[PDB]
């Protein structure tokens, strides 16, 4: 049983006493602050609104629970029981909050307003920033989606250059991150964010999240293929690696199958086992059911190049119309160890220099894709920009002397199209002057209700690469 009264930074419990007396409005906004990663994919707020913020989120029992916990946590009675009771009695426990946001999947340059939050009842001035902590966690799906998309750009560039098209791009980066994230909930959120850009995942948790909170026309948003792990190879015993390989490809003879080949000696496995002993079982496979050889150790670039070199001498290689080398359609490789945005770039460039097409390879990423990310990558941040005290609106901001990068925006904000079709954020309520057309933010939450939402299909469309559109 989630309790929103216990889902904030502890100090926020004490803030209702700290604002100027007679403050009736607190207005705040979220941005990926300007400071690589010049544009961000806005994704994940809809999950948060539906799972945690909407409907009756306050009850008598939840208030009492919070009261009891904070009494001990602070060793003092500081909890705003009266404020929460007001929301319970007046609004049947629905949050008197209005949130405006850019559409999910939108790709927006750094330093723009992405969403705004304000209270709709003057008694609830303190509520706007109470929910900062939970809303700021949107940094995570934003960052996964953005970093995943940047990797897609790299793959698109190199696939296009070495093959002349983008066929299969959406399957070139596979999510291996389930075991490497910090929790089950994180796994679902992170996997869903990756699926904004790609269709391949082994993080099953992502599927149910998308189905529940976003929705797709297709039965599922993401797909996988049969594959071995080291245990299904090593269990056969060291002297029987060939027997394991034979059993596995025979069990999965009519569908694609990935077989990890580095349990003892990746180079021996490729040259002698796959390349000689079991070659007859590989060359007989359909192009719809390739063997995918999976190295999993050593220097990622060096290993990929040597594996390709070996396979190229054991199997018939062709030269595509761009002049790049291509394995036969029944044989592919996946590199799924040590892949992050940096090593991904290094590998595809190294392959290009050695005249190997990117068609030959797919990538798996686990820790790099879903865990090795923090809120400071895109500087995702929530700040108060406008208050009303004694009936007077005041534009407020921080501006630390030692770090101009931490300066925050002033006043009421709105997002607009510029004459050249770019994005601009207007401060100080200047959007009201109507010199930049209509505000692009939409009301997505109001008084306990979700007022606008997006399907996962819409989100994917919004997040497309320019080259995909082109």
**Known binding-site positions:** 179, 202, 230, 294-296, 336-337, 367, 375
Q: From the list 96, 364, 411, 431, which residue makes contact with ligand 20O (rule: CB under 6 A)?
A: 364
Residue 283 engages its own copies in binding (rule: CB under 8 A): no
Stretch that binds its own copies, among 80-88, 131-139, 151-159, 418-426 (CB under 8 A): 131-139
Residue 9 engages ligand 20O in binding (rule: CB under 6 A): yes
d(CA 112, CA 117): 15
Residues 6+ apart with CB under 8 A from 369: 144, 147, 148, 173, 175, 176, 177, 190, 194, 339, 340
Q: From the list 7, 281, 450, 465, which residue makes contact with its own copies (rule: CB under 8 A)?
A: 7
Q: Which residue has the tokens 């306050």?
A: 58
Residue 152 engages ligand 20O in binding (rule: CB under 6 A): no
Binding site, annotated residues for beta-nicotinamide D-ribonucleotide: 202, 294-296, 336-337, 367, 375
Q: Which does 292 bind (CB under 5 to 8 A by kind): its own copies, ligand 20O, none?
A: ligand 20O
Closest CA to 358 of 348, 366, 350: 348
d(CA 7, CA 2): 8
Q: How many residues does the chain have?
A: 470
Q: Which does 15 bind (CB under 5 to 8 A by kind): ligand 20O, its own copies, none?
A: its own copies
Give min distance, CB of 305 to its own copies, in A.
13
What three-state secondary structure class fits 236?
coil
Question: Strand pairing of 257-260 and 318-319?
Answer: unpaired
- Note whether 155 and 167 are within 8 A (CB): no
Binding site, annotated residues for diphosphate: 179, 230, 294
Nearest 5°: CA angle at 105, between 410 and 36? 70
Count of residues of this chain found to bind its own copies when the rule CB under 8 A is applied? 112
Residues 6+ apart with CB under 8 A from 305: 350, 351, 354, 356
Give min distance, CB of 450 to its own copies, in A.
18
Binding mask 248-267 for ligand 20O (x = CB under 6 A): --------x-x---------
Stretch that binds its own copies, among 83-91, 264-272, 350-358, 461-469 (CB under 8 A): 264-272
DSSP 403-454: -GGG----SS-EEEE-TTS-EEEE-TTGGGG-SS-S---EEEEETTEE----
Q: Determine how many CB atoms are found less than 10 A away from the CB of residue 150.
A: 19
Residue 120 engages its own copies in binding (rule: CB under 8 A): no
Q: From the list 258, 335, 365, 462, which residue makes contact with its own copies (rule: CB under 8 A)?
A: 258
Closest CA to 440 of 466, 467, 421: 421
Q: From the list 104, 118, 202, 359, which residue makes contact with ligand 20O (rule: CB under 6 A)?
A: 202
Q: From the list 176, 245, 445, 456, which residue makes contact with ligand 20O (rule: CB under 6 A)?
A: 176
Looking at residues 286 to 325 of the shown chain, list those that interact with its own copies (rule: CB under 8 A).
296-299, 303
Stretch that binds its own copies, among 310-318, 380-388, 440-448, 458-466 (CB under 8 A): 380-388
Residues 6+ apart with CB under 8 A from 353: none
Of 317 and 394, which CB lies nearer to its own copies in the complex structure?
A: 394
Looking at residues 136 to 155 of the shown chain, list those that interact with its own copies (rule: CB under 8 A).
136-137, 139-140
Closest CA to 414 of 440, 434, 433: 440
Q: From the list 34, 82, 167, 171, which residue makes contact with ligand 20O (rule: CB under 6 A)?
A: 171
Of 286 and 299, which CB lies nearer to ligand 20O in the complex structure?
A: 286
Q: From the list 1, 11, 239, 469, which residue makes contact with ligand 20O (rule: CB under 6 A)?
A: 11
Residue 340 engages ligand 20O in binding (rule: CB under 6 A): no
Residue 396 engages ligand 20O in binding (rule: CB under 6 A): no
C-alpha pair distances (Å), 130 with each of 71, 105, 122, 469? 18, 26, 15, 40
Looking at residues 269 to 298 of the shown chain, list those that interact with ligand 20O (rule: CB under 6 A).
292, 294
Question: Strand pairing of 113-119 and 331-335?
Answer: unpaired
Give min distance, CB of 360 to ligand 20O, in A.
10
What three-state secondary structure class fits 171?
helix
Question: Strand pairing of 361-365 and 173-175?
Answer: parallel
Query: Which residues of this chain interact with ligand 20O, rule CB under 6 A?
Result: 9, 11, 171, 174, 176, 200, 202, 225, 227, 256, 258, 292, 294, 332, 334, 336, 362, 364
């Amino acid at each position: 049983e989630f309790n929103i009264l216990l889902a904030t930074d502890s100090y926020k419990v004490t803030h209702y006493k700290q604002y100027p007396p007679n403050t009736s409005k607190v207005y705040s906004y979220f941005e990926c602050r300007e400071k690589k990663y010049e544009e961000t994919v806005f994704y994940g707020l809809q999950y948060i609104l539906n799972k945690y913020l909407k409907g009756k989120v306050v009850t008598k029992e939840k208030i009492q629970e919070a009261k009891d916990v904070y009494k001990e946590h602070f060793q003092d009675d500081v909890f705003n029981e009266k404020g929460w009771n007001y929301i319970l009695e007046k609004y049947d426990g629905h949050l008197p909050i209005e949130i405006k946001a850019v559409p999910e999947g939108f790709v927006i340059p750094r330093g723009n307003v992405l969403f705004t939050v304000e209270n709709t009842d003057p008694e609830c001035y303190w509520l706007t920033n109470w929910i900062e902590t939970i809303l700021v966690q949107s940094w995570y799906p934003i960052t996964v989606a953005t970093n995943s998309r940047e990797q897609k750009k790299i793959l698109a560039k190199y696939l296009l250059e070495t093959s002349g098209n983008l066929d299969g791009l959406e399957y070139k980066l596979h999510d291996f991150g389930y075991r490497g994230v910090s929790s089950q909930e994180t796994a679902g959120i992170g996997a869903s964010a990756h699926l904004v850009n790609f269709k391949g995942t082994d993080t099953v948790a992502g599927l149910a999240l998308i189905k529940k909170y976003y929705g797709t026309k297709d039965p599922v948003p993401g797909y996988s293929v049969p594959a071995a792990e080291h245990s299904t190879i090593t269990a056969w015993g060291k002297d029987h690696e060939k027997d394991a390989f034979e059993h596995i490809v025979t069990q999965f003879s009519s569908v694609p199958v990935s077989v990890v080949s580095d349990s003892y000696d990746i180079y021996n496995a490729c040259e002698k086992i796959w390349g000689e002993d079991l070659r007859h079982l590989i060359v007989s496979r359909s192009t719809q059911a390739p063997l995918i050889i999976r190295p999993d150790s050593g220097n990622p670039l060096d290993t990929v190049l040597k594996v390709l070199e070996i396979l190229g001498k054991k199997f018939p290689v062709t030269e595509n119309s761009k002049g790049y080398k291509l394995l036969p359609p029944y044989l592919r490789v996946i590199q799924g160890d040590g892949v992050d945005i940096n090593t991904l770039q290094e590998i595809v460039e190294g392959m290009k220099q050695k005249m190997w097409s990117i068609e030959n390879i797919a990538f798996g990423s686990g820790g790099g894709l879903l865990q090795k990310l923090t809120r400071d990558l895109l500087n995702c941040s929530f700040k108060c920009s406008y208050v009303v005290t004694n009936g007077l609106g005041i534009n407020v901001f921080k501006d630390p002397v030692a770090d101009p990068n931490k300066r925050s925006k002033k006043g009421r904000l709105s997002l607009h199209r510029t004459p050249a079709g770019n994005f601009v954020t207007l401060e100080e309520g200047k959007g009201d002057l109507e010199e930049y057309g209509q505000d692009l933010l939409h009301t997505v939450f109001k008084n306990g209700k979700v007022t606008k939402s997006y399907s996962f299909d819409e989100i994917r469309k919004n997040a497309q690469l320019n080259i995909e559109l082109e």
